[PDB]
Each structure stands twice: as C-alpha cells, then as structure tokens.
Design an enzyme around this catalytic site. Sequence first.
Site, mmCIF file in Angstrom:
data_model
loop_
_atom_site.group_PDB
_atom_site.id
_atom_site.type_symbol
_atom_site.label_atom_id
_atom_site.label_comp_id
_atom_site.label_asym_id
_atom_site.label_seq_id
_atom_site.Cartn_x
_atom_site.Cartn_y
_atom_site.Cartn_z
ATOM 1 N N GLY A 199 0.788 -1.258 0.000
ATOM 2 C CA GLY A 199 0.000 0.000 0.000
ATOM 3 C C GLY A 199 0.809 1.292 0.000
ATOM 4 O O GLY A 199 1.867 1.375 -0.622
ATOM 5 N N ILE A 200 0.254 2.293 0.672
ATOM 6 C CA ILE A 200 0.841 3.611 0.845
ATOM 7 C C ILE A 200 1.073 3.883 2.316
ATOM 8 O O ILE A 200 0.527 3.185 3.199
ATOM 9 C CB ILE A 200 -0.049 4.736 0.238
ATOM 10 C CG1 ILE A 200 -1.497 4.602 0.712
ATOM 11 C CG2 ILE A 200 0.054 4.711 -1.268
ATOM 12 C CD1 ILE A 200 -2.295 5.887 0.566
ATOM 13 N N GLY A 201 1.893 4.884 2.584
ATOM 14 C CA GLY A 201 2.269 5.198 3.950
ATOM 15 C C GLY A 201 3.752 4.941 4.149
ATOM 16 O O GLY A 201 4.441 4.393 3.254
ATOM 17 N N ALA A 202 4.237 5.346 5.321
ATOM 18 C CA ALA A 202 5.671 5.340 5.603
ATOM 19 C C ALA A 202 6.278 3.934 5.521
ATOM 20 O O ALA A 202 7.414 3.771 5.058
ATOM 21 C CB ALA A 202 5.947 5.991 6.967
ATOM 22 N N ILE A 203 5.513 2.926 5.928
ATOM 23 C CA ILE A 203 6.012 1.523 5.986
ATOM 24 C C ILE A 203 6.269 0.951 4.600
ATOM 25 O O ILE A 203 7.384 0.504 4.289
ATOM 26 C CB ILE A 203 5.096 0.629 6.883
ATOM 27 C CG1 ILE A 203 5.402 0.918 8.356
ATOM 28 C CG2 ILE A 203 5.295 -0.865 6.621
ATOM 29 C CD1 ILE A 203 4.349 0.392 9.324
ATOM 30 N N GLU A 252 -3.220 -4.304 -5.016
ATOM 31 C CA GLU A 252 -4.507 -3.648 -4.950
ATOM 32 C C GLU A 252 -4.350 -2.221 -5.494
ATOM 33 O O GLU A 252 -5.151 -1.734 -6.314
ATOM 34 C CB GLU A 252 -5.053 -3.631 -3.531
ATOM 35 C CG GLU A 252 -6.536 -3.227 -3.492
ATOM 36 C CD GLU A 252 -7.107 -3.292 -2.093
ATOM 37 O OE1 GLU A 252 -7.191 -4.422 -1.573
ATOM 38 O OE2 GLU A 252 -7.451 -2.226 -1.522
ATOM 39 N N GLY A 297 -9.130 -5.116 1.773
ATOM 40 C CA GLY A 297 -8.584 -5.971 0.740
ATOM 41 C C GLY A 297 -7.384 -6.810 1.157
ATOM 42 O O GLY A 297 -6.990 -7.727 0.442
#
Lengths: 401, 401
Positions: free
Chosen positions: A186-190, A209, A307
């Site tokens: 996904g998105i975000g810092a991780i 996804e 998801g």
Amino acid sequence: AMKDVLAEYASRIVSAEEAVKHIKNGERVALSHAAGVPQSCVDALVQQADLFVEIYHMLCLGEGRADFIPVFFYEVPSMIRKDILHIDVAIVQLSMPDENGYCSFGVSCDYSKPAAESAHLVIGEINRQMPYVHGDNLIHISKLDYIVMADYPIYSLAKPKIGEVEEAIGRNCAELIEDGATLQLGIGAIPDAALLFLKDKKDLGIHTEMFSDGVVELVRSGVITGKKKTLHPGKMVATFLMGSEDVYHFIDKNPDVELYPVDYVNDPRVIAQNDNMVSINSCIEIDLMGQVVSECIGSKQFSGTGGQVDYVRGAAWSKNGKSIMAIPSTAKNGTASRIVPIIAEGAAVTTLRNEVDYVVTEYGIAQLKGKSLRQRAEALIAIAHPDFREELTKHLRKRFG
Amino acid sequence: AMKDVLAEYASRIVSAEEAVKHIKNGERVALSHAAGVPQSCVDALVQQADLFVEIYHMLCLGEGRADFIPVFFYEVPSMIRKDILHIDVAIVQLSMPDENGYCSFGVSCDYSKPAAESAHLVIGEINRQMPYVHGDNLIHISKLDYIVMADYPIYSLAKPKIGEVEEAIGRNCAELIEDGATLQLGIGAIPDAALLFLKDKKDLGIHTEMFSDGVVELVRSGVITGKKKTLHPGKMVATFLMGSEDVYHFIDKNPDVELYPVDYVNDPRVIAQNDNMVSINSCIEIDLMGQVVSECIGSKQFSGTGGQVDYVRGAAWSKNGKSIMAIPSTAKNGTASRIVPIIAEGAAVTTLRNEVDYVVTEYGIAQLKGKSLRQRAEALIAIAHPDFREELTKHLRKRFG
Ligand SMILES: [Cl-]
Ligand SMILES: [Cl-]
Ligand SMILES: [Cl-]
Ligand SMILES: [Cl-]
C-alpha cells in the site's frame, strides 16, 4: 474550423447540480473510489444535502458503523451484480472519451466500474485531468445517463516522513523480498520504507490492490520490470491508484499500467497465478495467537477496503508466496502495544490466526505458520516493544505455564 | 496347504510394544485420525509412558493448548511435506494388504496418509477389521518400518437422540437444500436431523470432510446418488469416516466410496468444482457482527479439525453454493446464548464475519451476506432465544442507536 469533441454528447451534458437532482431519497449511491472521487458531483450533493440517501464507499473518513457492510473486497462486484448489494446510482469519474466513444475509469476501477455497469442510473463525471488508464477499464459513453464536465486536479497524496521505526520495518520487509518477487503493498511510511530498501533487487513485478509514487520510482530506476511475472508479464497490475500528480502523468496512456476490476485483481485464485508473491499490509493489532485486527479507526489511512486478507489468501497459494503484516510495535504515542494478549473488546478479526504468515516490527521478524500457540506467543513477544514484553510474558505464563 | 498371507512380511512384523519402543524422547508422533486411531499401539504407548514425546492429533479430548498448532486442515499435508510441521513417527492403522502389497488407510486418509508418506519412521497397524476403502488411499507395505498385527473393532459411534431443538434446526437446513445439491456435513444430532428431513430430495451428492450413518441411510434409500455432481459423479467423496459397524461394512471394498487426503478434499478450489455445495457446520458462538467461534471446548465433538472454514470458503466459490452455521440458540442448559453481543474473552475466531453466509437456529434462518452491521444484528436477534433478545437488543441500541 476544428471539431467540438463534446458535440455529439451535448444532449446528455448537464451541470453537477442538474445531474445529482435525479437521485431519490432512500437510494444507495456508489462513488468512484479514493483518488477518483467525483469532486464536482460530491460538491453538488452536499449543496442539495437538505432535500436528501446512503453513500456506498470504502474510505476511512476521519483517517488519512451501522450501515457498514462486511464483505471481502474481491466479492463486491458479484454482490453488486447479484443485487445482494444494490446500487441505485453510480457517480463515476472518467477520462475524456476516445475516438470510439470509450471513457476510461482512470485511477478508480475497483468496484467503481462494476457499479457503473450495474446501477439503474449512471452519472459520468468527465474530467479533463482524469488520466486515460489501460486495462479492462473502459465504458462506452452511451451507457451514461448524465454527463457532468469537469477540469480539476484529482486528489493527490504527498509521501509521509519515514521515521527510524518505519525504516527498521522497511529493512526487515526487504529482507523477505527476493529477486523476481511480485509485490502487493500500500501507501504510507512503511511500504515506502520497504521500497526504499529494494534498490538492489532485480526484476520485481507488481500485482497489487494499488500502487503509488514509491512503486513508480522503482520502475523508473529499473528494479520493477515485471519481467519474471507469470501473469501479465511486463505490466503493473492494480485495481486503483493514488499518489502525486507525477504518478497520474506517468500512468496516462501508459500501456505498461493495467487496471482491472477488483473481482479480477483481488481474487485469491488470480493473485495465486503470480509466482513469488510478497504481500505487505499493516493492521491495528495482533494478539498472541496471531489473530489480526485491521479496521479504519487507528489506521491513519484514506482507503478502508479490507482488501488485505484477499492478498494473504492469494499469497498462500502463490509459488513461494509470503504475506507480511508490517506494523509499528506500538501505538498512541508509545503508550499502547500493537501486539496484545487479547484483541480489543468487540474488535473484528480481519485475518484468521490460521492464515497469518510473517509479522514484522522495528524489532524484527516472526513467522507464525507451523508454530504452536506457545511458540507463536514467544515469537511475537520477541518483536514487541521492550516496555510491553513483561506484561505479555505474564499472560503467556498464565496461559501455558 | 494354503498360503500364509503374512509370510513375506514376517521379518518386519512385531508386537505393539516392540514397535513403539523405537520412538525417541522429544519426537512428534502422528496417529491415524478419529475412528482409525491405532488402538494396539496406543495401548503400548501408555504402557511405556514412563520412559517417554508430542502426539500430533486433531481430536477434542474430553469432548464427544500450548502445543496446539493453528492451521487450516487442507494445508496440513503440505506443511508436513515441507517439514514446517515435522513428524518423526507415523503410527497408522491399515487394512490387510491386497495381492499387490498395498494396504488401505481404511477410514482415516485425512492427514494420516500424508504423515505416513513423510515420517522418518512408519509403524503400520494392520487390523483385520479395518475396512479396505477406495480412492487415493493406499500405501505399499514396503514403506512400513514396522508392522503390528491386530484384530479389533475400530471405534464406532452411536447416533444421538434428536430433540425438538435439533429437529427444528434440521428442518430449516433441509429448506436450504435443493435437488441435486452436493453436501458437506458432520455428525451429531443437528446434521442427523437435517438428513432426516431430506427424504423427499432427489439426486443429492456427497463431497464432505466426513460422513457417517445418516448419509449411508440416504444412499440406501436412493436420495443420495451423486448423479448430478460435477466432480466425482456417482461417488461419495470424503477424507475420513466414522459411524457404526454398519457404516464400516457398507464402505468395505465399495468403489462408490472414495477417500482422498485432506489437501485434496478440503481444498476450497477443489470443493468449488462441485456445483450446488451446501456446507453444514456448527460452532460455539456467533457475535452480532457474524464472527464465528468454533473450538473443541463446548463442542461435544470427537474431531476438532477446524475443517469447517475450508468448506465455508469452498461453498463461496461453488455455483449456487451455500454455507450454513447450524446451532442451538442456547448453551449450558439454556443459561447461555450462542448468539452473543461480543465473543468470549480470548476466543479464537474461526470463520470471519466477512465470509459467514447462513446462520440457522431452532428459531429460524438468517442470511448475513450483504447485510450491514445493523441488519446483521437484527437478523441474528430474531433467531436468538427469546430470553436473550432483550439484552442483545440493548447492545444493538448502544452501538447503532
Ligand atoms: Cl458474478
Ligand atoms: Cl521451541
Ligand atoms: Cl505440497
Ligand atoms: Cl432493513
């Protein structure tokens, strides 16, 4: 004199206010997902809010309950087609029509396309700035009951600061990704931090996804080629997209990017056809048995599709597949642990203890598959924050001596 | 003089005590599942218990935790083959060898066969009374490190009394089963009661984790023919069997009964190839969101495979598939509700709220798929015991007004 490219469709072109007027009280209205939310029609909706209706969406509003409908994301389109989840109105944002009269769903294919193909009434918001995105991602303009013209930048995301916790998690994730892996994340810092540690990897592929800026950067640098993929080789396959204006330019008319509806992309049986899946997702908490709770509240995320379990299940059937739950060991400014003896009261389990694979924090990596309850507890404790290990260990002891 | 049919194998034939002697401290020993538990070797094990070891089994001992290994039942064989769940010793009960030197696993194929095919040391307990059962259910006698001869009736089950609660549940289940359905269901008063209301059905088929007396009765009466099945037509397919001595005679050398290992039978992708699946299982409790908790404790059941979720997931991909959670509305002598506002503290969710389909009690039928949280709560409350509806409704109100 040059061609007026809107001319033929003039009869159905109306203002946003005129279009939404035809929604009726008590109806369910589906909107294009995430970055492709149809902004002009939404503004018109709040303006007429007085008169009005159930909005079906998969966003975490107030991040990044009565009417919530638990469903697997990949199952939504068939539920829509079978009228089990009935949609009276689909307001979808689209790219300009091509010469054949086909508009693209741009950055939001997901359930948005299935909704448009099933709804009683379809409003198409044609934005000059919605990119034309390839894949099974078109609809003929004749299917639109109303057309609302627009010209505005779609929603974008700035990349967040990566802290040392996120960096540590990212580095652990990278360790688990071998050359030729097909990724979902996904998105975000991780996830950004994970991708930052993949610059030395070779021929990674994408079946995800969604993706964003971090993935495109690795395409531009030659790491993500899709060249070792066993499904859709050489292509970045996704169901929706969100990122900076740069991502939206990179995907525009780019045939190496293909969106498909969510019942294709997120189907565990389709995911499984990609060898060497590595799925990376986060959650709110995980208990000592391995049950995973992932909800909107606490997530600091814009999309709440649920998801992730689709990808845990798909990775489990991928040749040499892996799924990773990558999380900060703590929450609420370090006052709370994400590795808990017992899930929160009333929390909804979203991935079963029987299916969790890897769990990753800033303190290291645990693989839970094949471990006993004792072994799982011990494995998770060792990657919990030191400030919570003592209390976790005493629950371990109360339970298993 | 007639042939001594044991002659050639005499070299490896030993007493039960001699055989189990070769197990070493700290080893994991897998036993044939359920009714095929190798009784002579188990007796020898408890006799030498002093000297000794981890027994891997899937039984609910004290019905019908540290060393428990959460896993999907269909995934066990690959986990065994990949040494993720390591088995040092397999003690399997077998039928007499045929002329080609092949023994059948009789009533216990499941993980028992995969264990025998992977374990470092294999003890075969050849029982004159273990039936020869068809399917992918054989092993050559040359694979056995030791052979222990036996002659004893395998474990049998008497059918339990059906009360009016169970009868009401059974009748509701039957309502959901149409002509030509392929069934999966277990043992106990509920499934028996369901089968009792299927005497008017036509050409039902079996693709099940296990079956017993109730199923065989419907075969003998012409209801269960397998004739409309799209996988293994005309055959009763299962992974293990348990019932009366009568069931064990009916299956002996019966080519219409085929057992396969659990990684075939319980694989959701294989289950899905049977059109019109109806899966019937019970659980301990279900919360108002639809999360399902099914564990050994409270189950009043001998087998705790956790295989039910495999069938919920397989039914979801079966053409016109259905899964049913069929439960008494109450427990603990009517002092407790199985429909709960919140699952019990520390309970393990075994089927996700996102995948539950039908729920059935003596008070009626609820279908949860496509319902909102409010709708789900209301639907479950209406099939809860009247004595619990008031308190459930107040939790509903606290949550959703
Ligand atoms: Cl469909
Ligand atoms: Cl250990
Ligand atoms: Cl395998
Ligand atoms: Cl309603």
